């Protein structure tokens, strides 16, 4: 029944402040420790700091100067506030519990939240432009989902009907904006006797785009 859940603005501008909340259930903050851990690409896991059962706190050496972790025991909430955010602060943030001496697992972090993605960028929310990738017994086609922000977008082919043989690549950044390619491989037959469409969804901009791939 132990559960931790992170929440908060998943998009923050540089130099600005990150404010996240960890809501726990199934245990009390009065006799448990809660830590904040972040995972940024290329930097494995990084312990940020934590707030202990009595309210005491300890922090990562590098982040101490701009990080403050607090809690509200009555609401079962732990808070993270970090200043002077920069690009490298983009990462998935997790809160995790350790029980201390009252637990068989001592100070190891035995329960983790699902994590919350944080992107630190000056870019503005932008819907993608979708371009076709047409060949110019099997055929590979695709669509280029270019210039959107922030992540993520989801791509399906013929509304999931072509689930087999789809490859959607990790997005890459260029001038603050993301671009991703998604490909689908289908029998030479379908390509000639049936329409193939890539359905792109971008939640953040409340947009859905359908691009039919037609022969060149």
């Amino acid at each position: 029944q132990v559960q931790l859940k992170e929440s908060g603005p998943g998009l923050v501008q540089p130099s600005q402040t990150l404010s996240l909340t960890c809501t726990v259930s199934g245990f009390s903050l009065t006799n448990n420790n809660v830590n904040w851990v972040r995972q940024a690409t290329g930097r494995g896991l990084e312990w940020m700091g934590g707030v202990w059962a009595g309210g005491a706190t300890d922090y990562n050496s590098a982040l101490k100067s701009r990080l403050t972790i607090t809690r509200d025991t009555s609401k079962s909430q732990v808070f993270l506030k970090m200043h002077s955010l920069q690009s490298e602060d983009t990462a998935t943030y997790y809160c995790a519990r350790d029980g201390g001496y009252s637990s068989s697992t001592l100070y190891a972090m035995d329960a983790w939240g699902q994590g919350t993605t944080v992107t630190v960028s000056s870019a503005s929310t932008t819907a993608p432009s979708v371009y076709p990738l047409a060949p110019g017994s099997m055929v590979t086609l695709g669509c280029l989902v270019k210039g959107y922000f922030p992540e993520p977008v989801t791509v399906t082919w013929n509304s999931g009907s072509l689930a087999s043989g789809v490859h959607t690549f990790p997005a890459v950044l260029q001038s603050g904006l993301y671009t991703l390619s998604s490909s689908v491989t289908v029998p030479a037959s379908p390509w000639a006797s049936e329409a193939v469409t890539c359905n792109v969804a971008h939640p953040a901009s409340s947009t859905k785009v359908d691009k039919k791939i037609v022969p060149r």
């Binding site: 494995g44 697992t105 001592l106 939240g113 432009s129 690549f169 260029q174 991703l180």
Partner: protein
């Protein structure tokens, strides 16, 4: 503070093999060490604590050992579900510190990439920019290289590549490489080629198209 050095940073092993990951603390941590497993796209989970105690539900094929500054995690009879990144962490003093992690992937038979090249769409050129795309799908091992050539001459700049995580079903990888250039640049040349170098061949796999065709 205490530094945690984990090796190897990455590892590929066959199903059924024995994997061994090391973690060295920069100072004696008196067994106050935990190991965490982070399966793909999931949160980290506690695997082992107090050096060798398995957390609830962790299978017996996992074991931890060590003392002083040297610790290790062992997985015997590696199973597909064990593909993940593993991290050690000490809790001897504050601040707590994590090792850099070890990324464990599955070995499988070599597979050559299926390569496809795509010219920019008429629609995108209207914008004044062009993206030429080369796909390299379902290959193994992951190591691969792409070289773009325009009218027979190599183009190094303006290229971005992206590779998928190992496929949970066929254990292969797929990669896309995109060469971006201005419309003027694109329209001033005719032959576009992507050359792919991979262990599976001794000369590059070449795919090309002519703008004028």
């Amino acid at each position: 503070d205490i530094q945690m050095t984990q090796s190897p940073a990455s590892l590929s092993a066959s199903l059924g093999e024995t994997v061994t990951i090391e973690c060295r603390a920069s100072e004696d941590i008196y067994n106050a060490l935990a190991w965490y497993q982070q399966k793909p796209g999931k949160s980290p989970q506690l695997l082992i604590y107090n050096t060798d105690t398995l957390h609830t539900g962790v299978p017996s094929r996992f074991s931890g050992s060590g003392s002083g500054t040297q610790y290790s995690l062992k997985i015997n009879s590696l199973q597909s579900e064990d593909v993940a990144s593993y991290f050690c962490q000490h809790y001897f003093g504050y601040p707590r510190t994590f090792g850099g992690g070890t990324k464990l992937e599955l070995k499988r038979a070599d597979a050559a990439p299926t390569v496809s090249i795509f010219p920019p769409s008429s629609e995108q050129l209207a914008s004044g920019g062009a993206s030429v795309v080369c796909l390299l799908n379902n290959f193994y091992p992951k190591d691969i290289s792409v070289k773009w050539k325009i009218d027979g001459s190599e183009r190094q700049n303006g290229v971005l590549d992206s590779v998928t995580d190992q496929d949970s079903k066929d254990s292969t990888y797929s990669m896309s490489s995109t060469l971006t250039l201005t419309k003027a640049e694109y329209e001033s040349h005719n032959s576009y080629t992507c050359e792919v170098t991979h262990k599976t061949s001794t000369s590059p796999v070449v795919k090309s198209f002519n703008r004028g065709e």
